[model samples]
Target: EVQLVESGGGLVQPGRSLRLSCAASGFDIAYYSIGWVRRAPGKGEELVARIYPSSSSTSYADSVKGRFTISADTSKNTAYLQMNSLRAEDTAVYYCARWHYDYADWPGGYGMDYWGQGTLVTVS
Candidate 1:
């Protein structure tokens, strides 16, 4: 089965930068976009952004503006989420998802059905 394996946890201090990886296996990386989502410590999940490896294009949720970036390495079938200017409020679990192109015409574009188990990043 296809899967997204995220890197382990890490701790970051305020005003620094951090990078997290979501390595995918069992699928063709070019056929899908790597997506980033965040789940607050105890809140619902929010779509952070998505990246197209072939073209290096991206779409991000307005809410995540100015603080995050998403990238991918097609050769390794891996995606990355980098967060800058870390703050205590930025602490949360981040997940990488495989975009489902079948839903592109749906009201919400497409939704993420396959997701990484999630990686916890703590900020101090």
Candidate 2:
């Protein structure tokens, strides 16, 4: 069984930074890539960032390209999402999901069977 527990939420002042954590259980976090998804109030869920531990490479959405960072710690079995320059529009619930890459040549991967309950963040 796979499980993800998210933490580090609540209020954040504008122009500040926030760091969220996702602790993985029942699996090794370093072996699988992790992705972050956020849903603003009444808005659709948007993919933000993903990190491939094996290659130490990461990808981010243009909307948050220079502002968000995703990383993982194999020894701790934890994934992190750090955001800088918070704004009111950044208020949302961020979800952590797992992705197991399948293809060796393609950037695309599959498998997000497990997801965290989500941590709500509000920028005031």
Candidate 3:
């Protein structure tokens, strides 16, 4: 039972960078993996990135491939996403989710089950 709370969001001018935080709790926060997702105001959701706290490994979406960075810190049981070169389109609600997987069962792209409420980031 892991829960994530998104924080650290405000106003950012175009071309500037914004870092978001997702604090995790409710379980062994140092073991499971976490991922990031974003939903543009009127658009659907997108996979921004994912992080394995136990392994310190991460993956990013091609859409944000080079302009964004995702990372996690096991020590703090937290995940982070840094998006650079902002735009109005970048203004969206970002969410953090925990991943649980078992190749014998839920394999590939289907482990993300629990998600945080979400934090909104506005880029103008």
Best-performing candidate as measured by TM-score: 2
Reference-based lDDT, each prediction: 0.77, 0.83, 0.76
Q: Taking the tens digit of each residue's C-alpha lDDT, what string does model 1 give over 14-96?
A: 88888888888888776777787888847777778787645667778776667888887778888888788877877888888
Candidate 1 residues lying further than 4 Å off, grouped into runs, are: 53-55, 104-110
Q: Which stretches of candidate 3 lie over 4 Å from their true place?
A: 53-55, 103-108
Q: Which ten residues in a row have the lowest lDDT in candidate 1?
A: 103-112
Model 2 residue 67 lDDT score:
87
Best by lDDT: 2
RMSD of each: 2.4, 2.1, 2.7
Ranked candidates, highest lDDT first:
2, 1, 3
User: Model 2's lDDT to the true fold?
Assistant: 0.83
lDDT tens digits, residue span 1-124, model 3? 5678888777889889888888888866666767788887469888788766545667788777788888877688777888888777788888888777441132245777688998888987
Clashing pairs in 3: none
Candidate 2: C-alpha RMSD after superposition: 2.1
Residue 63, candidate 1: Cα error in Å is 3.8
Worst 10 residues of 3 by lDDT: 100-109
lDDT of 2 by residue, 1-124 (tens): 7899999988979999999999999987777778888998588878888887668799888888888899988889999999898878889999998875453213443555678999999998
